Amino acid sequence: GPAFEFAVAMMKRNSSTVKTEYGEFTMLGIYDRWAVLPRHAKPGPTILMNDQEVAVLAAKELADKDGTNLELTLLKLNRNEKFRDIRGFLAKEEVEVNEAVLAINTSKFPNMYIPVGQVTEYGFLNLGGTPTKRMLMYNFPTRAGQAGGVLMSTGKVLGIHVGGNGHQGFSAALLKHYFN
Amino acid sequence: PAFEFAVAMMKRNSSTVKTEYGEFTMLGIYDRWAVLPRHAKPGPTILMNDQEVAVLAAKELADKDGTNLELTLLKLNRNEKFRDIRGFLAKEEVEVNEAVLAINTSKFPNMYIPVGQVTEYGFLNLGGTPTKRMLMYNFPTAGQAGGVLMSTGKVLGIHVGGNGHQGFSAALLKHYFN
RNA sequence: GUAAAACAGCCUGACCCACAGGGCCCAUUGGGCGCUAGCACUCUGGUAUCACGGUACCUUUGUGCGCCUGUUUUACC
């Protein structure tokens, strides 16, 4: 459909595979030389992006104003190629949709576009012991290595998958103000 | 970098294709026109990147004397036009000191291979058939039929066979398209 | 002959000047220019299609990297 036609373009032009000490993660690039990974990635001073060594110029583990974990890392990479500016495509506040697709790009999960269904705001969650805010939840079995997955609806990036359990999957929301 | 241009080329013009005879890298040259190793011999539909597409033509390529070029040219029913890489095809065959063979298939996902010097080669008895315009590089090679053999600013040809440490690509001449 | 590094750039009377004229391209009376080597985003329009949210190619503009010639500097064949 058009959600699939959006997601495929999205991963083709803005997604990447990234390797850190903890494993393989889909990574999404937002604008200029700036991109987003799970807080859990714990990106080093170098990351293998598409098996290629790239230097990290900066890394913010993202947190709200009262200081609890948002589960996103924003990193600025030292590279000459700039990203397609998708800032028009991510929401101002968390976004509910009846239908979304999660796009995963790892050796494990090559070119994976996965229909999640309804995405609903969720807010607070004690995610493996950590109090984390602004989650979204969709209804699907999630496995390992989809952390980093891109939650999408036509013309809208809704969040980045950061964890799940059994029959529920959770994405950190992706807000406009985090950039610019 | 042959590497940086070849990744560009494979993101914007390459694809993975399934036909009744196997899985092949496919490259699209312009609009809805793309080229395949003649061996696949597309049916009325083919799976392109796992989405089934209708094929409106499939010309098996041959010189004026009628000899086999090992290339099928097919027109796909899709609204998207391919990036016009015709400016990268030489008018006729090109030798190149260092070249890369680029594959996009499930077996060989995102493969980039420095083959080295490529030399004109011409005639070849390809499994019992005489074939013209082969190009030869020295690299060990099956299931890569379809790979895109190229260098920076030059797409030169499509791999169609090999043996041991020798690999041959049907040349890609500018005049073949329109 | 090969490797790092700096200045410059359409041509016409190594640099910086100065004038004058010859040429191409523009989003023009105002400006840009080495590309047989490109890659990336970006901007003006277009063409097509779509669940009207997009997406694909065409073209154009910048900038980053990459590259090519003139000239030259250190350490080496």
Domain ranges of chain B: 2-9+85-176, 14-76
User: Under CATH, which architecture does the A15-78 domain have?
Assistant: Beta Barrel (2.40)
Q: Which residues pair with B172 in a beta bridge?
A: none
A44: closest CA of chain B, how far (Å): 24
Q: How far is the CA of B83 from the C1' of C66 (A)?
A: 21
CATH 3.40.640.10 fits B14-76, yes or no: no
Contact B93, B120 (CB under 8 A): yes
Q: Is B93 helix (H, G, I), strand (E, B) or coil?
A: coil
Q: Which pair of tokens denotes residue B159?
A: 């791999």
CB atoms within 10 A of CB B89: 21
Q: Is B130 helix (H, G, I), strand (E, B) or coil?
A: strand
- Cα–Cα dist B176/B34, whole Å: 11
| Experimental approach taken | X-ray
Resolution (A): 2.9
Q: Is A27 helix (H, G, I), strand (E, B) or coil?
A: strand
Q: Which pair of tokens denotes residue A140?
A: 């699907």
Q: Do A2-11+86-178 and A15-78 share a fold?
A: yes
- Cα–Cα dist A97/A171, whole Å: 13
The pair phi, psi for residue B12, each rounded to 5°, is -95, -15
- Considering only CB atoms, which chain B residues are within 8 Å of A83? none
Q: Is B65 helix (H, G, I), strand (E, B) or coil?
A: coil
CATH 3.40.50.720 fits A2-11+86-178, yes or no: no
- The residue of chain A nearest to residue B7, with distances taken between CA atoms, is A50
Q: Is A134 helix (H, G, I), strand (E, B) or coil?
A: strand
**Domain covering B2-9+85-176 in this structure, CATH number:** 2.40.10.10
- Cα–Cα dist B61/B71, whole Å: 5
Contact A17, A105 (CB under 8 A): yes
Residues whose CB falls within 7 A of nucleic chain C? A 1-3, 5-6, 9-10, 12-13, 32, 80-85, 88-89, 154-156; B 1, 4-5, 8-9, 11-12, 31, 79-84, 88, 152-154
- Cα–Cα dist B149/B101, whole Å: 4
Q: Is A139 helix (H, G, I), strand (E, B) or coil?
A: coil
